[PDB]
């Protein structure tokens, strides 16, 4: 369901999705990705390095973001660039609730000669933003 270039245009705010994130999701990603760093699944290790609880992987959070973008674009193969700077950490307590990633987006650029459209992204946990400059672009 790749959307046509004519549909979207600059200033278009993107529908907010709120992704829940449990400690089990951090264990699964540890194995899937092969990133077995204890800070993402052992609390006592998290506090030694100076953190409250264990935190989500950086690339788990960005990876989730790809889903948030790929759904709206309608086609993963359409995405041309995906760039993110990691400003903060997403703590995920083993409390049976975990945490929530609130994603948002806004088209900031269109090139009608191209089929390119650029989305600025904003991901937050408890209000605090986890990404700095986070954009995506795709041929529509």
């Amino acid at each position: 369901a790749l959307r046509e270039f004519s549909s979207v245009k600059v200033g278009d705010q993107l529908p907010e999705k709120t992704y829940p994130l449990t400690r089990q999701d951090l264990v699964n990603y540890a194995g899937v990705s092969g990133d077995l760093n204890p800070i993402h699944w052992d609390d006592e290790i998290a506090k030694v390095v100076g953190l409250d609880t264990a935190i989500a992987h950086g690339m788990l959070t960005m990876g989730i973001g790809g889903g948030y973008v790929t759904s709206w674009v309608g086609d993963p193969g359409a995405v041309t660039e995906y760039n993110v700077r990691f400003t903060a950490v997403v703590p995920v307590p083993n409390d049976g609730k975990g945490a929530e990633l609130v994603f948002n987006g806004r088209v900031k650029s269109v090139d009608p000669e191209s089929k390119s459209v650029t989305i600025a992204l904003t991901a937050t946990t408890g209000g605090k933003k986890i990404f700095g400059r986070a954009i995506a672009s795709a041929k529509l």
């Binding site: 999701d25 788990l60 889903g67 193969g77 660039e81 990691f86």
Partner: protein, 139 residues
């Protein structure tokens, strides 16, 4: 500093689905091949950050091969950039040419920028991945 990884990474059909679930991507082009055909793709297309899998071996290895003056204990992943020249599809053979674009060393902290050009079996570019590690200096 050039480094060419020996052997390729072979994008698995099932590992794609497995990964997409892990990053909560539910786009049908990752799960059912006919939907990929509908989208206009022969095989299952990979999630945008799938290279975190393939590039796991690379980033672990290039640190030593590049002699980056950084302490692993205190190192931090600051920046990730993907230019998807061409979508990664299942059964793609992925080759890695990894370059060290820049190193900055100021007070206490070293900032390293590492570029991996991903090419297919034939040798045409797939994804340009740029990583920016930030860390505590070693020398």
């Amino acid at each position: 500093k050039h480094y060419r990884a020996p052997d390729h990474f072979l994008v698995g059909r099932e590992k794609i689905r497995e990964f997409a679930v892990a990053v909560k991507d539910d786009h049908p082009t990752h799960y059912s091949e006919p939907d990929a055909a509908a989208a206009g793709y022969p095989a299952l297309v990979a999630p945008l950050t799938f290279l975190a899998i393939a590039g796991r071996r690379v980033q672990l290895e290039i640190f030593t091969k590049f002699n980056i003056p950084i302490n692993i204990a205190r190192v931090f992943h600051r920046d990730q950039k993907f230019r998807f020249h061409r979508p990664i599809l299942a059964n793609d053979k992925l080759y890695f040419d990894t370059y060290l674009d820049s190193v900055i060393e100021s007070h206490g902290t070293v900032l390293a920028e590492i570029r991996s050009e991903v090419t297919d079996a034939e040798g045409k570019p797939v994804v340009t991945s740029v990583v920016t590690m930030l860390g505590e200096a070693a020398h």
